[PDB]
């Protein structure tokens, strides 16, 4: 029933091996979680998605891992309510295409869709619109969670199990195996954005057109930023801002399929574009080539952030693939990566010294009161991890009750200490 693979995160690093079941069979995979728990627990079970996660999260080495992807119904689709039903192994390219003929969008979507809805949630992943539309969690009207005891829980984020809830959200798979949700999606007429662009000249303008106000009449905003170049020209970005468009800003050619599926001069006003055009390695080049590396500073702590800016052009570290945006208020997810700040993720070549220079630059993010994301690590320690995140206690109690056997564990867990 299982295959015993080598697994990697998206970075292709830290392989390690586990007995990855298959199955489009929901009572199949309850079973398996049954026969972990009656064996006392071992080395557990995680669930998998789409492998887009870059660390060691989907991984569970000499233990279970549960491949999601073939649970990929979407059950309903309502546009009145804006809800959908879905298996958690549906992806987003999926869904977007599923639910745009109903007028429905898919509320968060990240840098890529091939993203599953369970890995969504368990990520609680942002995107450009973070600061208007909060993260994935945000918009999860229900879910059901298979827990360690084989029985499947309908979670809501306000009822009973709100707890539980808020601890799956963001919950690395360690709360149990989501097999299925309820995401509320936004109303859209086009599947169109209409985009105004602006170019800064140095960190201090990119801040400045960030806390200038303008950021509350765009509800995707996001750039392009330089990490190489020394002051002043340091932190120079790229900006791309703008909203779903109505069908009245369509060009003309474009209003008859309205909801179709799919340095200097870089200023514009208007500009209609697609998903495609309107958002837009590591795997074609790893693990041998780059290290991706995404941090958060609290919006209050703006020099702070413009000195790690400082400290990361200095260091002879060389990231030309950067990319910046102000995330807005925070859930209640005690794991919940954004909290309202400047956030930006790069991507440096891997060299000698590499690994000591990002140590420092946890210590950093650490002490001015930032985060790192799941999501793209690999390689932090247990005790940093724990010191980024002050729910983190919180957090592992809810985890305890529910998984007192630690039916649930992961490689990630493992490293971290959240087992
Ligand atoms: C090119 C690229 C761009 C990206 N851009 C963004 C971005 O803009 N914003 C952002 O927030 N993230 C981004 N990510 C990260 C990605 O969105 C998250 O890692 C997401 O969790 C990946 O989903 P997945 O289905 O591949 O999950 P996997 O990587 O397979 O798993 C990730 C975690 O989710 C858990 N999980 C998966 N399915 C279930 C389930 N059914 N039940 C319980 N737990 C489950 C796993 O246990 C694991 O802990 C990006 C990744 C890539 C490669």
Same mark, same amino acid.
């Given at each position: 029933?299982?295959?015993?693979?080598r697994?990697?995160?998206?970075?292709?690093?830290?392989?390690?091996?586990?007995?990855?079941?298959?199955?489009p069979?929901?009572?199949?995979?309850?079973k398996?979680?049954?026969?972990?728990?009656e064996?006392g627990?071992?080395?557990?079970?995680?669930?998998?998605?789409?492998?887009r996660?870059?660390?060691?999260?989907?991984?569970?080495g000499?233990?279970?891992?549960?491949?999601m992807t073939?649970?990929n119904?979407?059950?309903?689709?309502?546009?009145?309510?804006?809800?959908?039903?879905?298996? =958690?192994?549906?992806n987003?390219?999926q +869904?977007?295409? !599923? %639910?745009?003929?109903? @007028?429905?969008?898919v509320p &968060?979507?990240?840098?890529?869709?091939?993203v599953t809805v369970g890995?969504?949630?368990?990520?609680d992943?942002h995107?450009?619109?973070?600061?208007?539309?909060?993260?994935?969690?945000?918009?999860?009207?229900?879910?059901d969670?298979?827990?360690?005891d084989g029985?499947?829980?309908?979670?809501?984020p306000?009822?009973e199990?709100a707890?539980?809830?808020?601890?799956?959200?963001?919950?690395?798979?360690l709360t149990?195996?989501?097999?299925?949700?309820?995401?509320?999606?936004?109303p859209?007429s086009?599947?169109?954005?209409?985009?105004?662009?602006?170019?800064?000249?140095?960190?201090?303008?990119?801040?400045?057109?960030?806390?200038?106000?303008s950021?509350?009449?765009?509800?995707?905003?996001?750039?392009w930023?330089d =990490?190489?170049?020394?002051?002043?020209k +340091?932190?120079? !970005? %790229?900006?791309?801002? @703008?909203?779903?468009a109505? &069908?009245?800003?369509?060009?003309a050619?474009?209003?008859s399929?309205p909801?179709?599926f799919?340095?200097?001069s870089?200023?514009?006003?208007?500009?209609?574009?697609?998903?495609?055009q309107?958002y837009?390695w590591?795997?074609?080049?790893?693990?041998?080539?780059?290290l991706?590396?995404?941090?958060?500073?609290?919006?209050?702590?703006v020099?702070?952030?413009?000195?790690?800016?400082?400290?990361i052009?200095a260091?002879?570290?060389?990231?030309?693939?950067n990319?910046?945006?102000?995330?807005?208020?925070?859930?209640?997810?005690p794991?919940?990566?954004?909290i309202?700040?400047?956030?930006?993720?790069?991507?440096?070549?891997?060299?000698?010294?590499?690994?000591?220079?990002?140590?420092?630059l946890?210590?950093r993010?650490?002490?001015?009161?930032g985060?790192?994301?799941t999501?793209?690590?690999?390689?932090?320690t247990?005790?940093?991890?724990?010191?980024?995140?002050?729910?983190?206690?919180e957090?592992?109690?809810?985890?305890?009750?529910?998984?007192?056997?630690?039916?649930?564990?992961?490689?990630?867990?493992?490293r971290?200490?959240?087992?």
């Amino acid at each position: 029933t299982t295959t015993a693979t080598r697994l990697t995160g998206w970075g292709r690093t830290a392989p390690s091996v586990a007995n990855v079941l298959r199955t489009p069979d929901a009572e199949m995979i309850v079973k398996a979680v049954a026969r972990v728990a009656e064996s006392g627990g071992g080395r557990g079970a995680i669930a998998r998605g789409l492998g887009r996660s870059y660390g060691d999260n989907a991984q569970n080495g000499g233990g279970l891992v549960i491949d999601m992807t073939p649970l990929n119904t979407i059950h309903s689709i309502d546009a009145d309510t804006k809800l959908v039903d879905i298996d =958690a192994g549906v992806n987003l390219d999926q +869904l977007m295409k !599923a %639910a745009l003929p109903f @007028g429905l969008w898919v509320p &968060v979507l990240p840098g890529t869709r091939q993203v599953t809805v369970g890995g969504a949630i368990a990520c609680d992943i942002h995107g450009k619109n973070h600061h208007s539309a909060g993260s994935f969690g945000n918009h999860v009207r229900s879910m059901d969670l298979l827990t360690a005891d084989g029985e499947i829980r309908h979670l809501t984020p306000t009822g009973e199990d709100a707890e539980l809830f808020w601890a799956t959200v963001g919950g690395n798979g360690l709360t149990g195996i989501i097999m299925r949700a309820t995401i509320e999606m936004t109303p859209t007429s086009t599947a169109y954005f209409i985009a105004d662009g602006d170019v800064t000249a140095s960190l201090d303008e990119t801040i400045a057109l960030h806390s200038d106000g303008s950021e509350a009449r765009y509800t995707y905003s996001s750039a392009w930023f330089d =990490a190489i170049s020394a002051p002043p020209k +340091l932190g120079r !970005a %790229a900006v791309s801002r @703008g909203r779903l468009a109505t &069908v009245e800003q369509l060009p003309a050619k474009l209003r008859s399929e309205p909801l179709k599926f799919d340095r200097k001069s870089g200023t514009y006003r208007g500009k209609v574009q697609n998903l495609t055009q309107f958002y837009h390695w590591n795997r074609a080049y790893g693990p041998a080539g780059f290290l991706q590396y995404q941090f958060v500073i609290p919006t209050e702590a703006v020099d702070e952030f413009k000195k790690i800016i400082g400290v990361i052009q200095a260091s002879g570290h060389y990231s030309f693939l950067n990319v910046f945006k102000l995330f807005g208020p925070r859930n209640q997810a005690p794991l919940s990566f954004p909290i309202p700040g400047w956030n930006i993720c790069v991507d440096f070549p891997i060299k000698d010294g590499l690994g000591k220079f990002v140590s420092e630059l946890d210590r950093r993010v650490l002490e001015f009161g930032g985060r790192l994301y799941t999501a793209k690590d690999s390689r932090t320690t247990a005790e940093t991890f724990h010191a980024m995140y002050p729910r983190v206690d919180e957090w592992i109690s809810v985890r305890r009750k529910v998984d007192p056997l630690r039916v649930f564990a992961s490689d990630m867990a493992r490293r971290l200490e959240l087992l």
